[PDB]
Write an enzyme that holds these catalytic residues in place. Structure first.
Site, PDB file in Angstrom:
ATOM      1  N   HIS A  62       0.850  -1.208   0.000  1.00  0.00           N
ATOM      2  CA  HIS A  62       0.000   0.000   0.000  1.00  0.00           C
ATOM      3  C   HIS A  62       0.879   1.250   0.000  1.00  0.00           C
ATOM      4  CE1 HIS A  62      -2.581  -3.117   2.071  1.00  0.00           C
ATOM      5  NE2 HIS A  62      -3.274  -2.812   0.988  1.00  0.00           N
ATOM      6  N   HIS A  92       5.288   6.878   7.106  1.00  0.00           N
ATOM      7  CA  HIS A  92       5.049   6.482   5.722  1.00  0.00           C
ATOM      8  C   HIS A  92       4.596   7.705   4.960  1.00  0.00           C
ATOM      9  CE1 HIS A  92       1.025   6.075   7.698  1.00  0.00           C
ATOM     10  NE2 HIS A  92       0.586   6.688   6.612  1.00  0.00           N
ATOM     11  N   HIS A  94       2.137   9.205   1.433  1.00  0.00           N
ATOM     12  CA  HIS A  94       0.989   9.027   0.555  1.00  0.00           C
ATOM     13  C   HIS A  94       1.436   9.982  -0.604  1.00  0.00           C
ATOM     14  CE1 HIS A  94      -1.598   7.101   3.787  1.00  0.00           C
ATOM     15  NE2 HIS A  94      -0.994   7.890   4.675  1.00  0.00           N
ATOM     16  N   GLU A 104      -3.406  13.708   1.227  1.00  0.00           N
ATOM     17  CA  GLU A 104      -4.699  13.234   1.692  1.00  0.00           C
ATOM     18  C   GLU A 104      -5.527  14.438   2.136  1.00  0.00           C
ATOM     19  OE1 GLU A 104      -3.818   9.489   4.122  1.00  0.00           O
ATOM     20  OE2 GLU A 104      -4.741   8.967   2.188  1.00  0.00           O
ATOM     21  N   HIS A 117       3.285  10.935   7.143  1.00  0.00           N
ATOM     22  CA  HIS A 117       2.540  10.640   8.364  1.00  0.00           C
ATOM     23  C   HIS A 117       3.473   9.968   9.378  1.00  0.00           C
ATOM     24  CE1 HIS A 117      -1.603  10.388   6.169  1.00  0.00           C
ATOM     25  NE2 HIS A 117      -1.141  11.628   6.244  1.00  0.00           N
ATOM     26  N   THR A 196      -6.570   6.696   7.663  1.00  0.00           N
ATOM     27  CA  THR A 196      -7.039   7.007   6.327  1.00  0.00           C
ATOM     28  C   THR A 196      -7.118   5.772   5.456  1.00  0.00           C
ATOM     29  OG1 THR A 196      -4.820   7.636   5.653  1.00  0.00           O
ATOM     30  CG2 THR A 196      -6.312   9.374   6.365  1.00  0.00           C
TER      31      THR A 196
HETATM   32  N1  LIG Z   1      -2.661   6.608   7.078  1.00  0.00           N
HETATM   33  S1  LIG Z   1      -2.625   6.627   8.528  1.00  0.00           S
HETATM   34  O1  LIG Z   1      -1.606   7.500   8.960  1.00  0.00           O
HETATM   35  O2  LIG Z   1      -3.896   7.151   9.014  1.00  0.00           O
HETATM   36  C1  LIG Z   1      -2.356   5.177   9.077  1.00  0.00           C
HETATM   37  C2  LIG Z   1      -1.682   5.019  10.320  1.00  0.00           C
HETATM   38  C3  LIG Z   1      -1.410   3.734  10.863  1.00  0.00           C
HETATM   39  F1  LIG Z   1      -0.758   3.627  12.061  1.00  0.00           F
HETATM   40  C4  LIG Z   1      -1.805   2.568  10.182  1.00  0.00           C
HETATM   41  C5  LIG Z   1      -2.485   2.686   8.938  1.00  0.00           C
HETATM   42  F2  LIG Z   1      -2.876   1.560   8.264  1.00  0.00           F
HETATM   43  C6  LIG Z   1      -2.761   3.979   8.386  1.00  0.00           C
HETATM   44 ZN   LIG Z   2      -1.099   7.427   6.581  1.00  0.00          ZN
END
Ligand SMILES: NS(=O)(=O)c1cc(F)cc(F)c1
Ligand SMILES: [Zn+2]
Ligand SMILES: [Hg+2]
Length: 258
Positions: A62, A92, A94, A104, A117, A196
């Site tokens: 992903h 990570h 996006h 996002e 994030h 998200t």
């Molecule tokens: N995208 S996110 O930051 O909201 C997020 C955080 C997380 F700890 C695990 C996930 F699968 C997705």
């Molecule tokens: Zn995220």
């Protein structure tokens, strides 16, 4: 089916298997600057990443994550709208197929090239698994990336992407300093939201930084060369792994600056 970002298993299909998708506090949302409430009782952010221990980088199908040793208060976040200490567990990104999309959250409907994030969990809960069951279990710091000059602190990440091209691959990634990805100012917007991506649980306090960081075209270009697919399967490029903005419903976005 196993969720994704494609026509057939994308965000508009997630509700079939994850009913919470249509809930009251879903993320991401669009940040309307003229409607956000400046709150002077908000505290400044406290980011302590000097004793951070990065461990591994992995392509999970992903996106790719950089995992940190969260067995101790080694790299924490406190202050701002939070109560207690939250430990950094991973970060990570996006991103999009083009520089005009990828983030996002949006600000006044404007999309940035990508979004970082930094995920943290509330220490009072013991482990990550328990925190995802509480309304105040997680705190994610969101940072927008705009295309411009190279970000030196991001270069080590870019160099290693080659060895984690497909789903399931990982590489050792020790001694990374996350402090090299922070913008100069720590001014931010804040509101109650959710993950998200599925399971889309509403356990998150979102802290989005006002000031984006700059990264070069070649830097972002290398993100686009990752694969959604695993070794041996048909090749799907990893791009546009982002969820559309969700309706605010009855929530209020607050701001730490005026
Ligand atoms: N995208 S996110 O930051 O909201 C997020 C955080 C997380 F700890 C695990 C996930 F699968 C997705
Ligand atoms: Zn995220
Ligand atoms: Hg929760």
């Amino acid at each position: 089916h196993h969720w994704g970002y494609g026509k057939h298993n994308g965000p508009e299909h997630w509700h079939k298997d994850f009913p919470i998708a249509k809930g009251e506090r879903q993320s991401p949302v669009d940040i309307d600057t003229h409607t956000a409430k400046y709150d002077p009782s908000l505290k400044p952010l406290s980011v302590s990443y000097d004793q951070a221990t990065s461990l591994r980088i992995l392509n999970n199908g992903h996106a790719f994550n950089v995992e940190f040793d969260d067995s101790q208060d080694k790299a924490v976040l406190k202050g701002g709208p939070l109560d207690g200490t939250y430990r950094l567990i991973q970060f990570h990104f996006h991103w999009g197929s083009l520089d005009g999309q990828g983030s996002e959250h949006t600000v006044d409907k404007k999309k940035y090239a990508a979004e970082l994030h930094l995920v943290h969990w509330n220490t009072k809960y013991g482990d990550f698994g328990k925190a995802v069951q509480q309304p105040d279990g997680l705190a994610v710091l969101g940072i927008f990336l705009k295309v411009g000059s190279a970000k030196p602190g991001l270069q080590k990440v870019v160099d290693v992407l080659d060895s984690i091209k497909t789903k399931g691959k990982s590489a050792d990634f020790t001694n990374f300093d996350p402090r090299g990805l922070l913008p100069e100012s720590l001014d931010y917007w804040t509101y109650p939201g959710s993950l998200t991506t599925p399971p889309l649980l509403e356990c998150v306090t979102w802290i989005v930084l006002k000031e984006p960081i700059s990264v070069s075209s070649e830097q972002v270009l290398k993100f686009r060369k990752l694969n959604f697919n695993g070794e041996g399967e048909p090749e799907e490029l990893m791009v546009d792994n982002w969820r559309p903005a969700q309706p605010l419903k009855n929530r209020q976005i607050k701001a730490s600056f005026k």
